[PDB]
Structure 1
Amino acid sequence: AVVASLKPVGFIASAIADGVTETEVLLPDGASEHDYSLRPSDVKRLQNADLVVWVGPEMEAFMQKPVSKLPGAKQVTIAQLEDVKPLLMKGDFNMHLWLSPEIARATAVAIHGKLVELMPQSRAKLDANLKDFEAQLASTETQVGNELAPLKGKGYFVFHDAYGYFEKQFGLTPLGHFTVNPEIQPGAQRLHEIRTQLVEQKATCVFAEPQFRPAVVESVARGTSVRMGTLDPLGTNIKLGKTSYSEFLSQLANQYASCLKGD
């Protein structure tokens, strides 16, 4: 099996590995990429994996040590891909790379290349999977593009700084984020800054996330006319499979649009 660190990385892997091998995801639904420890049984899972796919050391702290034990031939470190480095946006870069369709393409190519070397017998199927992934993703980019276009100019805050690659591609205009690190709670001042910005900049929405209780987001919005939505950067509701990455980006767009559309 291909073992992916995070569900959306698994979505990409499952598009390429479909009908070739299984895909498994380490980080459970509901858990956060920023605050996690591997299960004791995960050591053996990573050792037995055909391929391990992850973003990198500045993202999944929990992956670095086990990954270092593996052959280079058996891992894809997305953030370190030569085609990915020039696409990194800010000496710190944002590491939520799975929400970049272009980085998803680079990842798919990387996975395709490692799996064709490990399993030359599967070359035809892997080739077709790569071509189908591209076709699906292109269609989704068009659809998402058209869904999000009318939402340009509607301001909003998100809970943590996870969406930059997606927002940049699709032209959304966020006012900002509650936190960078979603475990660390926002200060009373920051919450007031957001509440002030919210009223002054006439924001449409604030977004919670399923991984964290929305109380603090609800409090910034108490008494205001700002709507409340939820974004899921980790695709908890989407199941792994050939079309999962497309379904994920479509759902995320749907989550923005559900709150932002109108009034």
Structure 2
Amino acid sequence: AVVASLKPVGFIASAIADGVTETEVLLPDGASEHDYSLRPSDVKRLQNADLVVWVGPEMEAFMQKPVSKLPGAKQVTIAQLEDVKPLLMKSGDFNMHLWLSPEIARATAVAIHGKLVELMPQSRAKLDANLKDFEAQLASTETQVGNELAPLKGKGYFVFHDAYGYFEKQFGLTPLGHFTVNPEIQPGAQRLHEIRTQLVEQKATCVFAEPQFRPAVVESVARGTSVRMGTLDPLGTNIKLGKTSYSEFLSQLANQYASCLKGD
């Protein structure tokens, strides 16, 4: 199987590996990329993987050690790809939520395709078709999402944690900011006051929770204002792995933004 660290990384892999091999995901639905430790079984999957796909040591730190033991030919380290490095944004150091950038997802698919052709020469024609089919579906999805989000450009909102910058930059969304950088370090009152002052003063439309975290501080901030409440899921928990799952993921996230931000 191809073993992907996070579900959306899995979505990209499953486009390319479709009809070739299985895709498995390490991080369970509900879990956070910022607060996880590998299970004994997670470890076994890694050693036995045909290919491991992950963002890199500044993202899934919980995977760095077991991945370091594998052949270079059996891993894609997304953040370290030559075509990805020029695309990194500071938004230290650089923001590592790379699976929300279509352009990086493209570079990821190319790397996956390239590695799997070497490892599985029996599936070269299928892998080639899968890559073509992935690019076509992604290009259509980018057109669709760009349209869905266009009216929303310029509306301020806050997100729970700093996960969305690549997507927001791509499609012209204009976040006022985020509650947390690391979503485990709960934000203090300081702070929650600064956010609500921004909300009112800058006339924000939305605040967004995330299903991986209890929404209390988000609801608290919105309380006594006209700001609407929504939810974004940077990990696509309700989407199943499969050929068109990455496109479905981007479309779902866009719909989650629009659901709250619509109605000017």
TM-score tier, shorter chain, comes to over 0.9
- Shift of residue 85 of structure 1? 0.3
- Shift of residue 166 of structure 1? 0.1
| 1:1-263 to 2 correspondences below 5 Å | 1-90=1-90, 91-263=92-264
> Aligned residues: percent identity?
100
Q: Distance in 1 between matches of 2:50 and 2:154?
A: 45
Structure 2 length as normaliser, TM-score?
A: 0.99
- Shift of residue 42 of structure 1? 1.6
Q: Distance in 2 between matches of 1:181 and 1:145?
A: 28
Q: Distance in 2 between matches of 1:11 and 1:53?
A: 11
Q: Distance in 1 between matches of 2:191 and 2:86?
A: 32
- Shift of residue 2 of structure 1? 0.1
User: Unmatched 5+ residue regions in structure 2?
Assistant: none
Partner SS state of residue 154, structure 1? coil
Structure 1 range deviating more: 187-196 or 236-245? 187-196
- Shift of residue 153 of structure 1? 1.2
Q: Distance in 2 between matches of 1:125 and 1:117?
A: 13
Q: Distance in 2 between matches of 1:194 and 1:45?
A: 42
- Shift of residue 203 of structure 1? 0.2
Structure 1 length as normaliser, TM-score?
A: 0.99
Q: Distance in 1 between matches of 2:40 and 2:51?
A: 19
Partner SS state of residue 29, structure 2? coil
Deviations along 1:10-58, one digit per CA (max 9) or x if unpaired, are 0000000000000000000000000001111122111110000000000
Deviations along 1:128-162, one digit per CA (max 9) or x if unpaired, are 00000000000000000000000011110000000
Q: Distance in 2 between matches of 1:42 and 1:133?
A: 28
How many matched pairs? 263
Q: Distance in 1 between matches of 2:169 and 2:240?
A: 26
* Runs of 4+ more than 6 Å apart: none
Partner SS state of residue 165, structure 1? helix
- Shift of residue 182 of structure 1? 0.1
- CA root-mean-square deviation: 0.5
Partner SS state of residue 243, structure 2? coil
Q: Distance in 2 between matches of 1:43 and 1:172?
A: 38
- Shift of residue 88 of structure 1? 0.2
Partner SS state of residue 150, structure 1? helix
- Shift of residue 199 of structure 1? 0.3
- Shift of residue 116 of structure 1? 0.2
Q: Distance in 1 between matches of 2:18 and 2:124?
A: 12
Deviations along 1:90-142, one digit per CA (max 9) or x if unpaired, are 04000000000000000000000000000111110000000000000000000
Partner SS state of residue 115, structure 2? helix
